Amino acid sequence: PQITLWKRPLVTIRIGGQLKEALLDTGADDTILEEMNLPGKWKPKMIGGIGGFIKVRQYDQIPIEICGHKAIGTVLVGPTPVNIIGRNLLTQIGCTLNF
Amino acid sequence: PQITLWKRPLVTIRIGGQLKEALLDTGADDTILEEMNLPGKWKPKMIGGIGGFIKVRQYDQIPIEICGHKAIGTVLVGPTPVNIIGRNLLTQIGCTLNF
Numbered sequence A, B: 001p002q003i004t005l006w007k008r009p010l011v012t013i014r015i016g017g018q019l020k021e022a023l024l025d026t027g028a029d030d031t032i033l034e035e036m037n038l039p040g041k042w043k044p045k046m047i048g049g050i051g052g053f054i055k056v057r058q059y060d061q062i063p064i065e066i067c068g069h070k071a072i073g074t075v076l077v078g079p080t081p082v083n084i085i086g087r088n089l090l091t092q093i094g095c096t097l098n099f
């Protein structure tokens, strides 16, 4: 689709058969989701945002369907104010900015 | 133009004859720029993201030129590591997300 920006670009994602609302976030290098259980090995990582650094769990090769577009990539799980889809997955589903 | 998300979507902005590099950020409600001394009235605000909150100054009706496109609106100024063009001005320059 084409998505305008008068509203937050919130979209439904499917991950592990669960549906969640997430923010398409071009300012985010990485995809970070609120606390949840994902399977497989994870690695402790730290990441910085506007307010400082947080600790996250990094899961690799996780499938997520974003608006019915399939991605498979790195998902961080941690204390984010909202689920965010970052450029690592935005690129896989072919997302660009246009003006 | 069309901006891919392989790299950070940094573009040149102009604010009162200072040129700066800024993120076109669909995950940011409002534009926030690095510490700088804008003229006129402002109000204190806290904005929250990854890692917590920072204190900022909200200036209203500030003209910014973004890649040659004219915008005028709310500009928050505070201790951000990156300059961020948020949805409040992205809409004015005609910026959409597409996939």
Ligand SMILES: CC(C)CN(C[C@@H](O)[C@H](Cc1ccccc1)NC(=O)O[C@H]1CO[C@H]2OCC[C@H]21)S(=O)(=O)c1ccc(N)cc1
Pocket (backbone or CB within 6 Å): A023, A025, A026, A027, A028, A029, A030, A031, A032, A047, A048, A049, A050, A051, A081, A082, A084, A086, B025, B027, B028, B029, B030, B031, B032, B047, B048, B049, B050, B081, B082, B084, B086
């Ligand atoms: C987390 C979002 C809901 C909101 N953030 C915008 C977001 O695009 C920031 C924008 C951003 C970008 C760089 C540095 C700080 C903030 N990105 C971010 O935190 O991304 C993190 C995940 O991937 C990593 O890559 C960038 C930092 C990491 S925000 O910067 O905190 C923010 C919040 C409110 C406003 N008005 C403006 C900006």
